[PDB]
Enzyme design. Structure first.
Site, mmCIF file in Angstrom:
data_model
loop_
_atom_site.group_PDB
_atom_site.id
_atom_site.type_symbol
_atom_site.label_atom_id
_atom_site.label_comp_id
_atom_site.label_asym_id
_atom_site.label_seq_id
_atom_site.Cartn_x
_atom_site.Cartn_y
_atom_site.Cartn_z
ATOM 1 N N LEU A 121 0.827 -1.214 0.000
ATOM 2 C CA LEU A 121 0.000 0.000 0.000
ATOM 3 C C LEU A 121 0.857 1.258 0.000
ATOM 4 C CD1 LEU A 121 -2.732 -1.218 2.528
ATOM 5 C CD2 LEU A 121 -2.652 -1.504 0.052
ATOM 6 N N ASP B 135 11.483 3.146 4.807
ATOM 7 C CA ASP B 135 11.334 1.701 4.999
ATOM 8 C C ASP B 135 12.666 1.110 5.438
ATOM 9 O OD1 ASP B 135 10.433 -1.057 4.692
ATOM 10 O OD2 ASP B 135 8.898 -0.309 3.327
ATOM 11 N N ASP C 141 13.954 2.355 10.556
ATOM 12 C CA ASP C 141 13.067 1.554 11.379
ATOM 13 C C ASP C 141 12.172 2.497 12.180
ATOM 14 O OD1 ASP C 141 13.569 -1.330 13.583
ATOM 15 O OD2 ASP C 141 11.841 -0.027 13.325
ATOM 16 N N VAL C 142 10.854 2.399 12.027
ATOM 17 C CA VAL C 142 9.936 3.341 12.661
ATOM 18 C C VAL C 142 9.887 3.170 14.173
ATOM 19 C CG1 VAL C 142 8.397 3.622 10.680
ATOM 20 C CG2 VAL C 142 7.913 1.844 12.381
ATOM 21 N N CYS D 274 2.342 3.510 6.669
ATOM 22 C CA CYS D 274 1.954 2.196 6.171
ATOM 23 C C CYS D 274 2.858 1.090 6.712
ATOM 24 C CB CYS D 274 1.955 2.161 4.638
ATOM 25 S SG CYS D 274 0.676 3.206 3.895
ATOM 26 N N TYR E 232 -2.546 -8.263 16.545
ATOM 27 C CA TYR E 232 -2.760 -7.346 15.433
ATOM 28 C C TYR E 232 -3.883 -6.358 15.747
ATOM 29 C CZ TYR E 232 -2.972 -5.872 10.492
ATOM 30 O OH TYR E 232 -2.910 -5.153 9.320
ATOM 31 N N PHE F 279 -6.314 -6.557 1.143
ATOM 32 C CA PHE F 279 -5.664 -6.086 -0.076
ATOM 33 C C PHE F 279 -4.591 -7.064 -0.563
ATOM 34 C CE2 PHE F 279 -6.908 -1.720 -1.336
ATOM 35 C CZ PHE F 279 -7.933 -1.550 -0.424
ATOM 36 N N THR G 234 -1.362 -7.585 -1.361
ATOM 37 C CA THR G 234 -0.015 -7.079 -1.168
ATOM 38 C C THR G 234 0.910 -8.206 -0.726
ATOM 39 O OG1 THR G 234 -0.210 -6.624 1.181
ATOM 40 C CG2 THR G 234 -1.070 -4.952 -0.343
HETATM 41 N N1 LIG Z 1 -2.729 -5.892 2.809
HETATM 42 C C1 LIG Z 1 -3.832 -5.942 3.523
HETATM 43 O O1 LIG Z 1 -4.799 -6.669 3.242
HETATM 44 C C2 LIG Z 1 -3.890 -5.042 4.749
HETATM 45 C C3 LIG Z 1 -2.858 -4.277 5.143
HETATM 46 N N2 LIG Z 1 -3.003 -3.402 6.317
HETATM 47 C C4 LIG Z 1 -1.904 -2.523 6.784
HETATM 48 O O2 LIG Z 1 -1.397 -1.635 5.768
HETATM 49 C C5 LIG Z 1 -0.017 -1.292 6.050
HETATM 50 C C6 LIG Z 1 0.841 -1.725 4.803
HETATM 51 O O3 LIG Z 1 0.794 -3.182 4.689
HETATM 52 P P1 LIG Z 1 1.071 -3.924 3.294
HETATM 53 O O4 LIG Z 1 1.476 -2.908 2.233
HETATM 54 O O5 LIG Z 1 -0.210 -4.679 2.883
HETATM 55 O O6 LIG Z 1 2.159 -4.999 3.538
HETATM 56 P P2 LIG Z 1 3.610 -5.000 3.031
HETATM 57 O O7 LIG Z 1 4.377 -6.110 3.765
HETATM 58 O O8 LIG Z 1 3.690 -5.233 1.510
HETATM 59 O O9 LIG Z 1 4.333 -3.607 3.330
HETATM 60 C C7 LIG Z 1 4.850 -3.344 4.660
HETATM 61 C C8 LIG Z 1 6.169 -2.534 4.597
HETATM 62 O O10 LIG Z 1 6.469 -2.031 5.928
HETATM 63 C C9 LIG Z 1 7.900 -2.152 6.123
HETATM 64 N N3 LIG Z 1 8.252 -2.188 7.581
HETATM 65 C C10 LIG Z 1 7.986 -3.134 8.562
HETATM 66 N N4 LIG Z 1 8.418 -2.955 9.851
HETATM 67 C C11 LIG Z 1 9.049 -1.724 9.697
HETATM 68 C C12 LIG Z 1 9.748 -0.887 10.657
HETATM 69 N N5 LIG Z 1 10.140 -1.417 11.819
HETATM 70 N N6 LIG Z 1 10.278 0.266 10.281
HETATM 71 C C13 LIG Z 1 10.168 0.653 9.027
HETATM 72 N N7 LIG Z 1 9.581 0.045 8.024
HETATM 73 C C14 LIG Z 1 8.964 -1.243 8.327
HETATM 74 C C15 LIG Z 1 8.260 -3.463 5.379
HETATM 75 O O11 LIG Z 1 9.663 -3.576 5.058
HETATM 76 C C16 LIG Z 1 7.398 -3.342 4.096
HETATM 77 O O12 LIG Z 1 8.121 -2.557 3.117
HETATM 78 C C17 LIG Z 1 0.368 -2.069 7.336
HETATM 79 O O13 LIG Z 1 0.218 -1.176 8.467
HETATM 80 C C18 LIG Z 1 -0.654 -3.224 7.373
HETATM 81 O O14 LIG Z 1 -0.859 -3.643 8.751
HETATM 82 C C19 LIG Z 1 -4.250 -3.384 7.083
HETATM 83 C C20 LIG Z 1 -5.306 -4.124 6.689
HETATM 84 C C21 LIG Z 1 -5.103 -5.298 5.703
HETATM 85 N N8 LIG Z 1 -4.779 -6.596 6.422
HETATM 86 C C22 LIG Z 1 -5.202 -7.891 6.116
HETATM 87 C C23 LIG Z 1 -4.521 -8.728 6.957
HETATM 88 C C24 LIG Z 1 -4.598 -10.266 7.113
HETATM 89 S S1 LIG Z 1 -5.713 -11.170 6.062
HETATM 90 N N9 LIG Z 1 -3.691 -10.787 8.182
HETATM 91 C C25 LIG Z 1 -3.564 -12.295 8.464
HETATM 92 C C26 LIG Z 1 -4.421 -12.811 9.713
HETATM 93 O O15 LIG Z 1 -4.647 -11.982 10.622
HETATM 94 N N10 LIG Z 1 -4.880 -14.125 9.761
HETATM 95 C C27 LIG Z 1 -5.707 -14.561 10.929
HETATM 96 C C28 LIG Z 1 -7.226 -14.577 10.608
HETATM 97 C C29 LIG Z 1 -7.608 -15.392 9.359
HETATM 98 C C30 LIG Z 1 -7.052 -14.913 8.006
HETATM 99 C C31 LIG Z 1 -5.664 -15.482 7.644
HETATM 100 C C32 LIG Z 1 -4.550 -15.073 8.646
HETATM 101 C C33 LIG Z 1 -2.051 -12.727 8.515
HETATM 102 C C34 LIG Z 1 -1.268 -12.528 7.364
HETATM 103 C C35 LIG Z 1 0.082 -12.874 7.338
HETATM 104 C C36 LIG Z 1 0.660 -13.446 8.470
HETATM 105 C C37 LIG Z 1 -0.097 -13.641 9.622
HETATM 106 C C38 LIG Z 1 -1.451 -13.302 9.642
HETATM 107 C C39 LIG Z 1 -2.939 -9.948 8.854
HETATM 108 N N11 LIG Z 1 -2.825 -8.659 8.759
HETATM 109 C C40 LIG Z 1 -3.648 -7.983 7.780
HETATM 110 N N12 LIG Z 1 -3.819 -6.671 7.399
#
Ligand SMILES: NC(=O)C1=CN([C@@H]2O[C@H](COP(=O)([O-])OP(=O)([O-])OC[C@H]3O[C@@H](n4cnc5c(N)ncnc54)[C@H]([O-])[C@@H]3[O-])[C@@H](O)[C@H]2O)C=C[C@@H]1n1cc2c(=S)n([C@H](C(=O)N3CCCCCC3)c3ccccc3)cnc2n1
Ligand SMILES: NC(=O)C1=CN([C@@H]2O[C@H](COP(=O)([O-])OP(=O)([O-])OC[C@H]3O[C@@H](n4cnc5c(N)ncnc54)[C@H]([O-])[C@@H]3[O-])[C@@H](O)[C@H]2O)C=C[C@@H]1n1cc2c(=S)n([C@H](C(=O)N3CCCCCC3)c3ccccc3)cnc2n1
Ligand SMILES: NC(=O)C1=CN([C@@H]2O[C@H](COP(=O)([O-])OP(=O)([O-])OC[C@H]3O[C@@H](n4cnc5c(N)ncnc54)[C@H]([O-])[C@@H]3[O-])[C@@H](O)[C@H]2O)C=C[C@@H]1n1cc2c(=S)n([C@H](C(=O)N3CCCCCC3)c3ccccc3)cnc2n1
Ligand SMILES: NC(=O)c1ccc[n+]([C@@H]2O[C@H](COP(=O)([O-])OP(=O)(O)OC[C@H]3O[C@@H](n4cnc5c(N)ncnc54)[C@H](O)[C@@H]3O)[C@@H](O)[C@H]2O)c1
EC number: 1.1.1.35
Lengths: 255, 255, 255, 255
Positions: free
Chosen positions: C16, C35, C58-59, C85, C162, C195, C197
């Site tokens: 995102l 990032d 690192d945030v 994000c 989470y 989403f 991603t």
């Molecule tokens: N995608 C989605 O559907 C959703 C995203 N979000 C949020 O949007 C932001 C960006 O995320 P991203 O771009 O999608 O991921 P990315 O990895 O591509 O980008 C993250 C970036 O941050 C960087 N970064 C990182 N750390 C740092 C830091 N320290 N300092 C600086 N930078 C940092 C990292 O390097 C990377 O570049 C984050 O804050 C997310 O939490 C919220 C709702 C949705 N959203 C959907 C989600 C789902 S389905 N799960 C499931 C779940 O809960 N389950 C239980 C229930 C049943 C369903 C199946 C599983 C899950 C998925 C994976 C593993 C375990 C569990 C979780 N979280 C979700 N979030």
């Protein structure tokens, strides 16, 4: 303790209202069952004893509620508590493409009238009656409790009208609490999930049971006595005001 | 009835937790006061009788909470109820331009640590204890009640860290209830508004008057015994689960 | 227009955050991808052109965010927008009786620290940078946009940590907005549903497809550019402040 | 882009509805202004050019809405978007002890009928017209956008009927979205705070300026164009569905 309190319970001839009447009367309170003439309110009041009377009335009618409130005053001297349980349900899609069928306007209107307007009608009138009470040591003159539904938050397919009416209840809870705050009348709302009352008798056993199986814990329909218990809790607790409480076993309804 | 039940209560040395202990012990339950060593927990446990003991523990420490729970089993044999009241407050704006001042990171971390992590730490460890209980007639093995705050919903100026922590408690309430539903442990949350615990009663009288003046009805700080009454209602009502209940006299916080 | 605006986007190397950077740079803005060093920000910053740079950080670290903001000022002159994000996911039950498994404390803590503390760390530091901007004609100095999740409202089985972290983001949205309102900095939050991603890649394909099948309409995972569109809409609309917006195709998550 | 879409806008002769029409027509869309006969809608349509026409109608009327939709079909061939802005306001306490005055039933019924039933009336009929469209590339047949109010959430003293009507809107948003999900019609709702429209004209200038002064940021009434911007953003973003969006400068209303 609810001993000695006077409660007007709409929809008191059946399901959640009746269960509320039973519990409170069983604790030494007096109950007025406000329900339609066609219901069995008269018989229920007869079964619940000398501290319980039936006042036949339609909640959508000013005159009827005035009559029942006058009756309550006349028999028990005052009204301490009002519980809005009168309500009806319908299932009807907003629009069905495959069937080319449209939700009718009057189905939406009739549900709005009984559930939302009917509840407000009792509220505005009973608030004038509680206004005449001397405030207790805590400044309180009365307690009003309404019944919404989790459909106010997660209405399912077919639930547009029901959801509108119950969402209306939720939305007017705080403003009415604010209105009545200077005269010491608390206003609270309970949102039941799924409860075993005649409301649900109209559906296929496989339908009910399925619904039943969705409650996370405990995995069953709620017991009307559990609704009654929460009503008493609210009556007893002087700091509960302006809030909606889900009573639903932690269920969240899917489409 | 809570007679015979065993409750572990964090922040039990003071304010809301203490009020809960007093009422549950007064009602025939057994209570473990979980609080910091330097507090007056021992004295309150001594005062409350043989059915109440003090367990020194920091809720942010796994070992401490394990220690306290082992003490509770050893003393009362099982745990039926857990109530998370342990908490801290800070007032600090995110940024002050006029002062050139920034909220410190560790002020934010500390409040999170005690209020949110600390509560989860007790929940996860106490759930494992409750999982050893034989389910009751209702299939229930335990009830866990958390303390959020209305600041979860209307956080005021200065309340960013506190609001974060209490919103986290609100947010995890349902998924934890979902998690533990297969084993019969209900998970509920109370969101207090303004209550007369040392947190507020130790403020200047003009301030107390002012704060009370903000609660619509009744126009006073909440009595800790009213929180306790609500804890009991939730323990007693088998169908309350996965929900957050505002206990606040219908106030909504302004900035 | 976002034309000429400077946005620091944390988590900008992927999903995102990356799409937000693509859209904004595409709409004439400049972007700083904040990032981790091991992320591919450097390559993504080169792909986007002259108006996009990579700031390694690192945030959860004060100094890193300080270093990245200084990078952003020196390179682009000021900061007008911040989008949080950066975030991590874990799936872990509070307790599992049958498996004999208890959520670890450090899994809860790590999720809190990155998702919640990390976001507040960026917020508090970038607020001081925006406070040095001269207000525009509308009094505005900055816009901050956070990422929560629908797990703040319907946490699923396994999402307690989470949900805690995202409920935190939701709860502190209004107080921070109240905090910064005197200096014209808006604070908004987006709650994405599901989403497509790299976040979801760890999940078995079967689960990803199943989750996709459950979005009511449109029946698919959200496209990261749809998130990006909402960020721009918030940047552009001067009256959006202190609110959380669900972007989820009307889904409501079940256990 | 909204260029080429056909939008039916109730309350189109004035305030938010008019501003919406202005913006969409300005962006290339076609609009039908649905408003009362004694409104100046004709004059507004005439001013907006060939791509805007007026349909005289009362939204509480099946026949009138049927007529205005047929007018729309005949002039532009289809309906792609519906925006409900038609609405009225009343200020009246549920019960006023000071004056010994009671909210009238008809004051409650009128507000429900126009604000809530009228909105459902348009939605159910226009869903029928959008059903006739072949789905676009994303399977979409149309977008429906309703107007609630922050009164749905923090109704003020005097706002019970209004709050009931807008809470109803909020409530039925999800079920209707779920209803129409299989045919590709999105349903969204905007909850405006305080906006500079003729709705507020009948208030004393003092109340108005005092109300405006409580908006945290920006500290002014909302600009009707800002409502229009949000409508456009919702039309444009394919993944916004079943949700309510607060547009209110982060205000929270007090009693
Ligand atoms: N995608 C989605 O559907 C959703 C995203 N979000 C949020 O949007 C932001 C960006 O995320 P991203 O771009 O999608 O991921 P990315 O990895 O591509 O980008 C993250 C970036 O941050 C960087 N970064 C990182 N750390 C740092 C830091 N320290 N300092 C600086 N930078 C940092 C990292 O390097 C990377 O570049 C984050 O804050 C997310 O939490 C919220 C709702 C949705 N959203 C959907 C989600 C789902 S389905 N799960 C499931 C779940 O809960 N389950 C239980 C229930 C049943 C369903 C199946 C599983 C899950 C998925 C994976 C593993 C375990 C569990 C979780 N979280 C979700 N979030
Ligand atoms: N039970 C429950 O689970 C729930 C109840 N409630 C409310 O609680 C109150 C008391 O109701 P009751 O005691 O259960 O019914 P009762 O009929 O035994 O008693 C009501 C009394 O009111 C009296 N009364 C009446 N009118 C008046 C008047 N004018 N004046 C004075 N008194 C009046 C009347 O005579 C009677 O004695 C009412 O306000 C109910 O709306 C809310 C949430 C729950 N709740 C669950 C519900 C379900 S599953 N549906 C489904 C649904 O939505 N479906 C679509 C989606 C999938 C689910 C399956 C079907 C449904 C069920 C049956 C028929 C149609 C629709 C609906 N509403 C629901 N509410
Ligand atoms: N403006 C705002 O701040 C807000 C508006 N809204 C809604 O936005 C929509 C558009 O309305 P509009 O353009 O602003 O008014 P308009 O008159 O210019 O246009 C309406 C059009 O609909 C048309 N129309 C109409 N009927 C029909 C019909 N039948 N069929 C077809 N078309 C119809 C009509 O002809 C007209 O062209 C409506 O649905 C409104 O309800 C929600 C939140 C905000 N919002 C703020 C509000 C305030 S401060 N009040 C106060 C209040 O509650 N007080 C108590 C608490 C303390 C605060 C002070 C007072 C109020 C104001 C005036 C009079 C009484 C009460 C009320 N409602 C509010 N809504
Ligand atoms: N009183 C109010 O106005 C109000 C409003 C909203 C929420 N709350 C919440 O109610 C709960 C109880 O507050 P109270 O009014 O009883 O406060 P209190 O300060 O009277 O009691 C807090 C207790 O928590 C204990 N505690 C603090 N850190 C601890 C730790 N790390 N480990 C173990 N114990 C610890 C304290 O020693 C104290 O005994 C808290 O979560 C508070 O945030 C209070």
């Amino acid at each position: 303790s609810v001993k000695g309190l006077v409660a007007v319970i709409t929809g008191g001839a059946s399901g959640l209202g009746l269960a509320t009447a039973e519990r409170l009367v069983g604790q030494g309170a007096s109950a007025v069952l406000l329900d339609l003439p066609n219901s069995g309110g008269e018989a229920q009041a007869k079964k619940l004893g000398n501290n319980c009377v039936f006042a036949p009335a339609d909640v959508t009618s000013e005159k009827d509620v005035q009559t029942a409130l006058a009756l309550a005053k006349g028999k028990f001297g005052r009204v301490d508590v009002a519980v809005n349980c009168a309500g009806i349900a319908v299932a009807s899609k907003t629009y069905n493409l495959k069937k080319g069928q449209t939700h009718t306007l009057e189905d939406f209107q009739r549900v709005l009238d009984v559930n939302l307007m009917g509840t407000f009608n009792v509220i505005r009138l009973v608030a004038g009656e509680m206004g005449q009470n001397e405030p207790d040591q805590g400044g309180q003159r009365g307690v009003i409790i309404n019944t919404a539904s989790v459909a106010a938050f997660e209405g399912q397919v077919g639930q547009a009208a029901y959801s509108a009416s119950k969402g209306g209840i939720v939305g007017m809870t705080l403003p009415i609490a604010r209105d009545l705050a200077p005269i010491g009348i608390r206003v609270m709302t309970i949102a039941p999930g799924l409860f075993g009352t005649p409301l649900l008798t109209s559906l296929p056993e496989k339908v009910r049971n399925f619904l039943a199986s969705q409650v996370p814990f405990p995995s069953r329909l709620g017991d009307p006595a559990e609704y009654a218990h929460l009503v008493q809790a609210i009556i007893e607790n002087p700091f509960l005001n302006g809030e909606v409480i889900r009573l639903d076993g932690a269920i969240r309804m899917q489409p």
